[PDB]
Design a protein around this ligand. Structure first.
Ligand SMILES: Cc1cc2nc3c(=O)[nH]c(=O)nc-3n(C[C@H](O)[C@H](O)[C@H](O)COP(=O)(O)OP(=O)(O)OC[C@H]3O[C@@H](n4cnc5c(N)ncnc54)[C@H](O)[C@@H]3O)c2cc1C
Ligand SMILES: Cc1cc2nc3c(=O)[nH]c(=O)nc-3n(C[C@H](O)[C@H](O)[C@H](O)COP(=O)(O)OP(=O)(O)OC[C@H]3O[C@@H](n4cnc5c(N)ncnc54)[C@H](O)[C@@H]3O)c2cc1C
Ligand SMILES: Nc1ccccc1C(=O)O
Ligand SMILES: Nc1ccccc1C(=O)O
Lengths: 684, 684
């Protein structure tokens, strides 16, 4: 049952279809090239060298290899991040970023002989992330070993909320220190109420298709689902769930579930003095700090229930590592494999330039324009046949939103407010061109993008000797030291991760991994933004000491009468002075970590997810596609960036074929035709 | 009719009762001293010299004057902010702050002859903010003149969302450039749906007591309601509204209202051509950017409907200025008045120290302990009879949450992780002491405080000649230039406010006032945190250029042949180079601007609002009270800070009288007994 290789994870998730794209398994769509292109010499730009852009490049490579003699694809990849791996062909980050897949290498002067790696962005990969594992197989092979990510509960864990402490491993109460824990009771109540049972009676509060979500998850993952089930999910049942529940937050749903359980007597008054509403509140907030398997989702309580349900269906918490020292190696290997698969028909050039503007203009074949600035702030203008905008939404906004929403005789585009040179474009149309006649339709996609929610996130790291865990002051549970701590201290979630450069001498002490308001509460103490230290030779000691100080709390345990300062204070203080670190995604140019949908946001994110269907309108001459986890129903996952890239390339194939969906492979067609189109075109 | 003096505003809202405290008009409670104290020589601490702490001092002065000969009150006021007015007897901030009432004086070398003031925090005051005006009258007199705050719609305004532009004043179509504007139509739909009609048919979607909120607002503002009506609101109908709608976001509510109106045919398909869900979505997001009279509430869409409904009942948008050059003068004048009214019986000393911990300890008469650090990090400990903790929630957390939840024989408290000196306290109980026997009751208050939502906010300012508004490219209405701009450019809300140091030569160009995700999106560009410039003589020129560059957008006006760069880009660029500024409340030690409740947050904030009722439990003997807008149902308003102060002093009086509510005035008594108690046992 535990996957031990890339191939075992890959095969576990190969069939899984997400509910907003329930007709199609993306890994099955990706098994062969996505389609065919007419003979030609295509000039394509990819803006962004992260997971989205690089997956898109790989699929373009697969398409290029199918082109006849004399034809080919030339791709210009724009990548503004000076630390990207694409520009590299104590704490080091240079060359160790692929967007939000971002490593920091801790070393003592020789980066080839390092101590540990801080995984600053992506770090844990669901088993049924089928497209992720599909690409991991392309990058590494099916035989490459993987490990269980050491989430809370997967290793011995301490949980602290208010007066409550729990030490546990797993969900078997035999392996909880207090089998009568209220935490365990609330967890069962919330699981019953949200997920329900895969067999038998339906007990969940928020059914899909009048059944528990556990039953729908099994259908979505089936090799051979019942006839019509996937269509009915896609067109009826999941839309009905959204109609009912997209206006309900995760926090509101947890409180409804808790309230019913408290009324029934399943959850008792917290002790003899708490009133009704206070007891209900305590349980809601207790569950909030505990979570679903990856730490407290209290900070994520404003997400739509729809968004949580996507993660429930996916079994999101059951996560693995990649077969790497640094996760960036996955994206770097995919980039190299893209060039190999192109078979010499794909040529790639990297531009260390920031794109400022996209538009359609002029009367040439190559009408998709990109205006960029290089590292000397010099302007460049380049025209393309097709462009894939592979950047998340706040980075995309300035590129797409400043050209208005209809034809313009001329525009002087660029970063004029910065004092940078502009370029005059003539006969201009917006880049995200949903209509030649309706400014509102053009506005809808732009405004949607600009109002997606980027979740805030920060990570505080230090380097500690792994042997620190063996000290008598670190608790042991079930034969191993505590290596995950979930708490209301302000740190939120903390992990003591063995170094992947190796039992290793060192561990990465992820002292605090925060989301949303948990991150906001810390931000004043970070000192430098987005990264402290901002240099390779510094250490964020002052910042880190503020985190240590949040851990300076008197904690009463059942095992001792006199409360002492929390042991975790001592462990955080055991970290070495050098190489203390924080990265704040919020103050990075991404304006946060990743998209999570609020109530009502489905309508915006889904528009983005379906945007590539514009290629069905042959009379619309739109050359731009979008490729990021921002434009998916899995913001915060490689799987979402990869899904979005698959969408983008499928749309581009249809556009290149002037609206002919038959140019997509049989298995890839549903990527376009299984969605509600964003343009109205005739049936069939 | 428009109010023209402090006294006119004061009388307007004198009776208004908020729905969570519907049995009391706070201005009426505050008219006479709140009660009486036994004879004695009291030693009190107030932590924080903002609006909460200073109003609490004022009320303690009033009490002090009533004490008999030989009795008195000594107050130690702790204020950590070096820029506080309390510590003061180009951009200058020193001496110009009272917490989140914060001015920046723009000058050329002589601060007595400045150019303009930037109101960095509080700036606009609802007419019906009765307690605010009550204190403004204490500070300035009833005769002092006030002005209508130049909100969007109160002065000529441009609104931009997607392809839609409107130019307007108020809500009469005759005063809109496009009287058939869809924007104005959606405002009527959403207002009808949320607020409804004060007379006639009930048209609102979310009734209170089965009627439109407008009807309830009239009852809550009556001199002589029903007695029965107030109690029924307090105990039945507002609680039922909470039960129903605390789990519904404002954004979800807006979409429900728009959906029904679109199905009825009150709103047309957008462009004649977007589909049903695209049309509804467009209208929801259009309304989101337009707002309720103070700019778009899109960034606030995650607040509960309960929270928005408090502001609807209060007519919050109808706002005025104070009779000052800088709003901090209000708080300074209240400080000075506190000392005058204490008639010699009040002694005040100011400490420039940061409180690190509070607790009860020991066996002496004075048990309420405060541990603090001065500006060079020396430790101080002092014991008091009573303590008012007048700091917002994130600042309160470290003070109250690190001592555990029950009796402890001894603790070494302080900022040990910062390397600062600790102090040993013996026989220690938590400061927010709700139980002698329940650690969960103690944990509930602490955990609630720590998880309140501090809304993010930032303000970008520059100095501009007022005459820039007379440039030919600045639009005008009846001779008056546009002075407010509400946009989806990233700037959110922009104002050109005439200097109060005076027609004035200069204006404060509030180039961007953002909340929540609107602020997050900008934050990467701020450069220095929380303030750029950090010095008096620097300028945030690079930051401000990024704001000019967000305004560099092609905007199409009706009738025009082509889009042209937005005129507002030109206006922003007219600001002088010197004195460009941002302040980010999020990276200040407050960890944001002010409390706004998410879905499910009622129970956390309401617990805090009712906390002072612990005074009813005589044997408990808890000496700590809390006083901030964080512990109110008006986070983001002085009114909330003042209400919480009034609560804190009322509770203090009851506690000083060993639980006897007859020590409060007849008018003040409901401050305590009109709320559900926080201690169920013992009764009181
Ligand atoms: C804190 C955090 C935790 C996460 N946890 C996980 C996890 O455990 N598992 C998982 O699967 N995923 C996780 N993710 C999500 C995963 O990192 C993202 O889904 C994925 O990396 C996003 O790829 P992308 O291509 O959409 O965007 P990005 O990674 O943001 O890449 C975009 C690229 O475009 C470039 N760029 C942007 N603007 C421009 C411009 N104007 N011109 C030129 N270049 C530009 C950028 O420099 C960047 O390299 C996490 C992310 C973060 C930040
Ligand atoms: C951007 C913004 C816009 C706003 N707009 C409006 C508006 O237009 N109208 C309106 O009525 N209100 C407005 N408000 C709200 C208003 O400013 C607040 O409600 C009010 O000022 C808060 O007072 P307070 O006493 O609760 O807290 P604060 O003002 O935060 O004061 C707390 C004080 O305690 C001190 N302190 C904190 N921690 C410690 C410690 N450990 N030891 C010692 N001292 C400490 C601080 O330095 C500070 O001086 C706005 C606020 C902001 C920030
Ligand atoms: N990567 C994520 C995205 C969304 C929510 C949680 C996670 C998590 O890793 O727990
Ligand atoms: N001061 C506020 C608090 C809450 C929401 C709006 C405002 C405003 O001034 O518009």
């Amino acid at each position: 049952k535990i996957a031990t290789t890339v191939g075992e994870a890959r095969l576990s998730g190969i069939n899984y279809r997400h509910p907003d794209s329930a007709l199609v398994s993306y890994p099955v769509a990706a098994a062969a090239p996505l389609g065919r292109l007419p003979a030609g010499n295509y000039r394509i730009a990819i803006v962004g060298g992260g997971a989205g852009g690089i997956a898109a490049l790989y699929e373009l490579g697969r398409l290029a290899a199918t082109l006849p003699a004399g034809s080919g694809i030339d791709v210009q990849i724009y990548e503004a991040d000076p630390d990207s791996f694409l520009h590299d062909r104590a704490i080091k980050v240079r060359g160790l970023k692929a967007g939000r897949v971002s490593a920091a290498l801790v070393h003592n002067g020789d980066p080839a002989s390092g101590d540990t790696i801080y995984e600053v962005g992506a770090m844990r990969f669901p088993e049924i992330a089928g497209l992720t594992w599909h690409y991991a197989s392309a990058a590494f092979g099916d035989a490459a070993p993987i490990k269980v990510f050491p989430n809370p509960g997967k290793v011995p864990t301490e949980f602290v909320f208010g007066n409550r402490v729990d030490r546990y491993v797993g969900s078997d109460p035999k392996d909880w220190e207090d089998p009568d824990s209220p935490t365990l009771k609330v967890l069962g109540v919330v699981a019953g109420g949200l997920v329900g049972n895969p067999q038998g009676e339906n007990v969940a509060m928020y059914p899909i298709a009048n059944v528990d979500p556990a039953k729908i998850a099994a259908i979505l993952n089936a090799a051979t689902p019942p006839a019509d089930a996937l269509e009915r999910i896609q067109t009826k049942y999941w839309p009905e769930f959204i109609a009912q529940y997209d206006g309900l937050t995760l926090g509101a749903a947890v409180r409804e579930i808790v309230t019913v359980a408290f009324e029934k007597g399943t959850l008792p008054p917290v002790d003899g003095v708490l009133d009704v509403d206070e007891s209900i509140s305590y349980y809601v907030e207790l569950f909030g700090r505990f979570g679903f398997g990856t730490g407290g989702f209290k900070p994520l309580y404003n997400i739509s229930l729809v968004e949580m349900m996507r993660l429930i269906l996916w079994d999101y918490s059951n996560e693995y590592t990649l077969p790497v020292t640094e996760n960036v190696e996955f994206i770097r290997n995919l980039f190299l494999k893209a060039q190999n698969v192109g078979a010499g028909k794909l040529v790639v050039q990297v531009r260390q330039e920031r794109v400022a503007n996209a538009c359609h203009s002029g009367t040439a074949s190559a009408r998709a324009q990109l205006l960029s600035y290089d590292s000397h702030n010099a302007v460049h203008s380049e025209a393309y046949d097709f462009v894939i905008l592979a950047v998340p939404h706040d980075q995309l906004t300035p590129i797409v939103s400043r050209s208005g929403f209809e034809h313009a005789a001329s525009q002087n585009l660029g970063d004029a407010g910065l004092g940078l040179e502009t370029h005059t474009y003539n006969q201009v149309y917006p880049p995200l061109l949903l209509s030649d006649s309706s400014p509102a339709a053009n506005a809808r996609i732009v405004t949607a993008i600009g109002q997606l929610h980027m979740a805030r996130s920060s990570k505080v790291f230090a380097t500690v000797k792994t042997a620190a865990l063996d000290q008598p002051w670190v608790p042991q549970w079930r034969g191993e030291p505590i290596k995950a701590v979930v708490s209301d201290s302000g740190l939120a979630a903390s992990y003591v991760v063995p170094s992947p450069i190796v039992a290793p001498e060192y561990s990465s002490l992820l002292a605090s991994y925060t989301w949303e308001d948990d991150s906001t509460r810390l931000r004043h103490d970070f000192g430098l933004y987005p990264q402290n230290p901002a240099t390779e030779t510094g250490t964020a000691d002052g910042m880190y000491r503020t985190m240590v100080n949040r851990a300076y709390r008197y904690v009463k345990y059942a095992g001792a009468s006199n409360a002492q300062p929390w042991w975790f204070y001592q462990l955080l203080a055991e970290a070495r002075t050098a190489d203390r670190f924080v990265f704040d995604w919020t103050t990075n140019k991404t304006a946060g970590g990743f998209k999570l949908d609020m109530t009502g946001d489905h309508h915006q994110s889904n528009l983005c997810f379906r945007y590539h269907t514009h290629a069905l309108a042959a009379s619309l001459d739109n050359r731009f596609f979008i490729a990021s986890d921002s434009y998916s129903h899995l913001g915060g996952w490689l799987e979402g960036a990869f899904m979005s890239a698959l969408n983008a390339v499928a749309g581009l194939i249809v556009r290149a074929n002037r609206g002919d969906v038959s140019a997509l492979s049989t298995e890839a067609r549903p990527l376009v035709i299984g969605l509600r189109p964003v343009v109205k075109v005739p049936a069939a």
